[PDB]
Coordinates of all heavy atoms in Angstrom, one line a residue:
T106 N 6.2 1.9 5.4 CA 7.0 0.8 4.8 C 7.1 -0.4 5.7 O 7.0 -0.3 6.9 CB 8.4 1.3 4.3 OG1 8.9 0.4 3.3 CG2 9.4 1.4 5.5
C107 N 7.4 -1.6 5.1 CA 7.3 -2.8 5.9 C 8.2 -3.9 5.3 O 8.7 -3.7 4.2 CB 5.9 -3.3 6.1 SG 5.0 -3.6 4.6
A108 N 8.4 -5.0 5.9 CA 9.3 -6.0 5.4 C 9.0 -6.5 4.0 O 7.8 -6.6 3.6 CB 9.3 -7.2 6.4
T109 N 10.0 -6.9 3.3 CA 9.9 -7.6 2.0 C 9.5 -9.0 2.5 O 10.1 -9.5 3.4 CB 11.2 -7.7 1.3 OG1 11.7 -6.4 1.0 CG2 11.0 -8.4 -0.1
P110 N 8.4 -9.6 1.9 CA 7.8 -10.8 2.4 C 8.8 -12.0 2.6 O 8.5 -12.9 3.4 CB 6.7 -11.1 1.3 CG 6.2 -9.7 0.9 CD 7.5 -8.9 0.9
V111 N 9.8 -12.1 1.8 CA 10.9 -13.0 2.0 C 11.5 -13.0 3.4 O 12.1 -14.0 3.8 CB 12.0 -12.9 0.9 CG1 12.9 -11.6 1.2 CG2 12.9 -14.1 0.8
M112 N 11.3 -11.9 4.1 CA 11.8 -11.8 5.5 C 10.9 -12.5 6.5 O 11.3 -12.5 7.7 CB 11.9 -10.3 5.9 CG 13.0 -9.6 5.1 SD 12.8 -7.8 5.2 CE 12.9 -7.5 6.9
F113 N 9.7 -13.0 6.1 CA 8.7 -13.4 7.1 C 9.1 -14.6 8.0 O 8.8 -14.6 9.2 CB 7.4 -13.8 6.4 CG 6.5 -12.6 5.9 CD1 5.5 -12.8 5.0 CD2 6.8 -11.3 6.4 CE1 4.8 -11.7 4.5 CE2 6.0 -10.2 6.0 CZ 5.0 -10.4 5.0
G114 N 9.8 -15.6 7.4 CA 10.2 -16.8 8.1 C 9.1 -17.6 8.8 O 9.4 -18.1 9.9
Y115 N 8.0 -17.7 8.2 CA 6.8 -18.4 8.8 C 7.0 -19.9 8.9 O 6.3 -20.6 9.6 CB 5.6 -18.2 8.0 CG 5.0 -16.8 8.1 CD1 3.9 -16.4 7.2 CD2 5.4 -15.9 9.0 CE1 3.3 -15.2 7.3 CE2 4.8 -14.6 9.1 CZ 3.8 -14.3 8.3 OH 3.2 -13.1 8.4
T116 N 8.0 -20.5 8.1 CA 8.3 -21.9 8.2 C 9.4 -22.3 9.2 O 9.7 -23.5 9.3 CB 8.7 -22.5 6.8 OG1 10.0 -21.9 6.4 CG2 7.7 -22.3 5.7
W117 N 10.0 -21.3 9.8 CA 11.0 -21.6 10.8 C 10.5 -22.1 12.1 O 9.3 -21.8 12.5 CB 12.0 -20.4 11.0 CG 12.5 -19.7 9.7 CD1 12.3 -20.1 8.4 CD2 13.4 -18.6 9.6 NE1 12.9 -19.2 7.5 CE2 13.6 -18.3 8.3 CE3 14.0 -17.8 10.6 CZ2 14.4 -17.2 7.8 CZ3 14.8 -16.7 10.2 CH2 15.0 -16.4 8.8
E118 N 11.4 -22.7 12.9 CA 11.2 -23.0 14.3 C 10.7 -21.7 15.0 O 11.3 -20.6 14.7 CB 12.4 -23.6 14.9 CG 12.3 -24.1 16.4 CD 12.3 -23.0 17.4 OE1 13.2 -22.1 17.3 OE2 11.5 -23.0 18.3
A119 N 9.8 -21.8 15.9 CA 9.0 -20.6 16.4 C 9.9 -19.6 17.1 O 9.8 -18.4 16.9 CB 7.8 -21.1 17.2
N120 N 10.7 -20.1 18.0 CA 11.6 -19.2 18.8 C 12.6 -18.5 17.9 O 12.8 -17.3 18.1 CB 12.4 -20.0 19.9 CG 11.5 -20.5 21.0 OD1 10.4 -19.9 21.3 ND2 11.9 -21.5 21.7
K121 N 13.2 -19.2 17.0 CA 14.1 -18.6 16.0 C 13.5 -17.5 15.2 O 14.0 -16.4 15.0 CB 14.7 -19.7 15.1 CG 15.7 -19.1 14.1 CD 15.9 -20.2 13.0 CE 16.7 -21.3 13.5 NZ 17.0 -22.3 12.4
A122 N 12.3 -17.8 14.7 CA 11.4 -16.8 14.0 C 11.1 -15.6 14.8 O 11.1 -14.5 14.3 CB 10.2 -17.5 13.5
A123 N 10.8 -15.8 16.1 CA 10.5 -14.6 17.0 C 11.8 -13.8 17.2 O 11.7 -12.5 17.2 CB 9.9 -15.1 18.4
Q124 N 13.0 -14.4 17.4 CA 14.2 -13.7 17.5 C 14.5 -12.8 16.2 O 14.9 -11.7 16.3 CB 15.4 -14.6 17.7 CG 15.5 -15.2 19.1 CD 16.8 -15.9 19.3 OE1 17.3 -16.0 20.4 NE2 17.4 -16.4 18.2
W125 N 14.3 -13.5 15.1 CA 14.4 -12.9 13.7 C 13.4 -11.7 13.6 O 13.9 -10.6 13.2 CB 14.1 -13.9 12.7 CG 14.2 -13.4 11.3 CD1 13.1 -13.2 10.4 CD2 15.4 -13.2 10.5 NE1 13.6 -12.8 9.2 CE2 15.0 -12.8 9.2 CE3 16.8 -13.3 10.8 CZ2 15.9 -12.5 8.2 CZ3 17.7 -13.0 9.7 CH2 17.2 -12.6 8.5
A126 N 12.2 -11.9 14.0 CA 11.2 -10.8 13.8 C 11.6 -9.6 14.7 O 11.5 -8.4 14.2 CB 9.8 -11.2 14.3
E127 N 12.1 -9.8 15.9 CA 12.5 -8.7 16.8 C 13.7 -7.9 16.1 O 13.7 -6.7 16.1 CB 12.8 -9.2 18.2 CG 13.4 -8.1 19.1 CD 13.2 -8.4 20.6 OE1 13.1 -9.6 20.9 OE2 13.1 -7.4 21.3
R128 N 14.6 -8.7 15.6 CA 15.8 -8.1 14.9 C 15.4 -7.3 13.7 O 15.9 -6.2 13.5 CB 16.7 -9.2 14.5 CG 18.0 -8.8 13.8 CD 19.0 -8.2 14.7 NE 20.4 -8.2 14.1 CZ 21.0 -7.0 13.8 NH1 20.5 -5.9 14.1 NH2 22.2 -7.1 13.3
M129 N 14.4 -7.8 12.9 CA 14.0 -7.1 11.7 C 13.2 -5.9 12.0 O 13.3 -4.8 11.4 CB 13.0 -8.0 10.8 CG 13.8 -9.3 10.2 SD 15.3 -8.9 9.2 CE 16.6 -9.5 10.3
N130 N 12.4 -6.0 13.1 CA 11.5 -4.9 13.5 C 12.3 -3.8 14.1 O 12.0 -2.6 14.0 CB 10.5 -5.5 14.5 CG 9.4 -6.3 13.8 OD1 9.2 -6.1 12.6 ND2 8.7 -7.1 14.6
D131 N 13.5 -4.1 14.7 CA 14.4 -3.1 15.2 C 15.1 -2.4 14.1 O 15.3 -1.2 14.1 CB 15.4 -3.8 16.2 CG 14.8 -4.1 17.6 OD1 13.7 -3.7 17.8 OD2 15.5 -4.7 18.4
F132 N 15.5 -3.2 13.1 CA 16.1 -2.7 11.8 C 15.1 -1.7 11.2 O 15.5 -0.6 10.7 CB 16.3 -3.8 10.8 CG 17.7 -4.4 10.8 CD1 17.9 -5.8 11.0 CD2 18.8 -3.7 10.7 CE1 19.1 -6.4 11.0 CE2 20.1 -4.2 10.7 CZ 20.3 -5.6 10.8

């Protein structure tokens, strides 16, 4: 299983997106 695509955040500022990815990936 993997993220629902709405979680991707590809349009966000890069650092914020990386923080988000780490959080989602921990979830």
Side-chain angles (χ1 to χ4, degrees):
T106 205
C107 60
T109 304
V111 74
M112 293 163 61
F113 285 162
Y115 289 171
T116 62
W117 312 357
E118 188 276 315
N120 287 339
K121 178 197 290 184
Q124 286 192 153
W125 181 257
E127 171 155 30
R128 179 81 161 114
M129 293 306 105
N130 283 342
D131 286 355
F132 269 127

